[PDB]
Structures are given as structure tokens and as C-alpha cells.
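Students often ask why inverse folding is considered easier than folding. One informal answer: many sequences map to the same fold, so there is more than one right answer. In these notes we will look at a single instance of the problem. The structure comes first.
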């Protein structure tokens, strides 16, 4: 099975004892049951941004979500990712929709990874516009780029799932390493006639051969085959 680390924005009704009772941002380590959560004050119709960072010395994965002119929400979790992920990964974005009329539009996405064993080894990319046949993205499921230069992760006019992976593998650790780190950011627009629709969007890190697991729609965010 796939090895998943993710930052989720999640407004599906969460059913298990001990889950948040509100839309939330969370940090997921190999399971849908988040290791750490905070309230997500969701605003359909308005552009939002997520920032994510991690460093192998601090060993603290942190994320923040915010909207223009509003207060931001943060979440953090202490973890050694070398004990969880393989050395080579792929990074990506995912979204799912419930029985609602909503869009999951990504307007921009950038990423940086550094690895020190000599100046460091590194990789950086930024998409502020998405082109129509993007040969440096692996699109899975329903995901596609429209003619306005936007990345649409789920179907545009129910129950959709789609993902976009950066094409090249990322080197996040090696045995002779001093420190490694990564940063990511993306901006998103959730359009809907409803104010609080059940929806999901993630940034994630996986084994390089990852694909959409069978039965992973809705609350499993296109990342996990089951809730255990
Ligand atoms: Mn959740």
C-alpha cells in the first residue's frame, strides 16, 4: 500500500469518536485519523492560501491556512519523517467532493526541497499559471487544466476525485545526510452556492509509484483506501 504524509483541509462530517466537530486543518501520518488538528474557518467564494514546512533537525511539521484580511489558523506535529517516508518521494495535491455543487480550483503552487550531505542539493518549482497540456504534472482521476490557466482538481459542470503530482522524484533523505528540509505553498478557490459544503483538499507526499486507491473518495481525500 502507499505511504502517505499529508496536510488536509477537511469539511466532511467526521464520524469517529475523538474527531473535530468542525471544518478543520489537520496533519496526517499514514492514516486518515489526523495526528493534530485546528479549526478551519472556511470561506467559499474567497481565495485561500496554505503554507507547509519541515526540517530534519527541528523535526516539526507545521502548516498555516489563511484568507485575505482574516486571521490565520496553524497546526504543528512533532515527527521524524525519515522514520515514515522512503528516501525518494513524489509530492502532489488532491481533492474530493461530496454530494454538493462545488469546484476545487488551484491558482498557484510552489515547492522547495534541500538536502545536505559542498553547497546543498536542491529542487524548486513554481506554477503561477497552469498550461493546457502540462507535461511536468501527472494528472490522475478527474483533474485537468482549463483555458484560464487554472488547475481544476475535481469535475466542473458530484462525487469527484482528482490529483496532480510533480513529475520528478524528490530526494528527501540519504544515509550520509546532515539536514534536509522542504517548503510548499498553494492557493485555492472553492466556489459553491452553499456556504459550508462538504469538501476536501490536500498537499501530500508519497512513494513515487502512488496512485488513487480504490474506494478513496469523499472523506478519504483520494489518499487512503480505508479509515483505519
Ligand atoms: Mn479530517
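Output (designed amino acids):
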Amino acid at each position: 500500500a502507499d505511504t502517505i504524509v499529508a496536510v488536509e483541509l477537511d469539511s466532511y462530517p467526521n464520524t469517529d469518536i475523538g474527531d473535530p466537530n468542525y471544518p478543520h486543518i489537520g496533519i496526517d501520518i499514514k492514516s486518515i485519523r489526523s495526528k493534530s488538528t485546528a479549526r478551519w474557518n472556511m470561506q467559499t467564494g474567497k481565495v485561500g492560501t496554505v503554507h507547509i514546512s519541515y526540517n530534519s533537525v527541528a523535526k516539526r511539521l507545521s502548516a498555516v491556512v489563511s484568507y485575505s484580511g482574516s486571521s490565520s489558523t496553524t497546526v504543528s506535529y512533532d515527527v521524524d519523517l525519515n522514520n515514515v517516508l522512503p528516501e525518494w518521494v513524489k509530492v502532489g495535491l488532491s481533492a474530493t467532493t461530496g454530494l454538493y455543487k462545488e469546484t476545487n480550483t488551484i491558482l498557484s503552487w510552489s515547492f522547495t526541497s534541500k538536502l545536505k550531505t559542498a553547497d546543498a542539493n536542491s529542487l524548486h518549482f513554481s506554477f503561477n499559471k497552469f498550461s493546457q497540456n502540462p507535461k511536468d504534472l501527472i494528472l490522475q482521476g478527474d483533474a485537468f487544466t482549463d483555458s484560464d490557466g487554472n488547475l481544476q482538481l475535481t469535475k466542473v459542470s458530484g462525487n469527484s476525485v482528482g490529483r496532480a503530482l510533480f513529475y520528478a522524484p524528490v530526494h528527501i533523505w540519504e544515509k550520509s545526510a546532515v539536514v534536509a528540509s522542504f517548503d510548499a505553498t498553494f492557493t485555492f478557490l472553492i466556489k459553491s452556492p452553499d456556504r459550508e459544503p462538504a469538501d476536501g483538499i490536500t498537499f501530500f507526499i508519497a512513494n513515487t509509484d502512488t496512485s488513487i486507491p480504490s474506494g478513496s473518495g469523499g472523506r478519504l481525500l483520494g489518499l487512503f483506501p480505508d479509515a483505519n
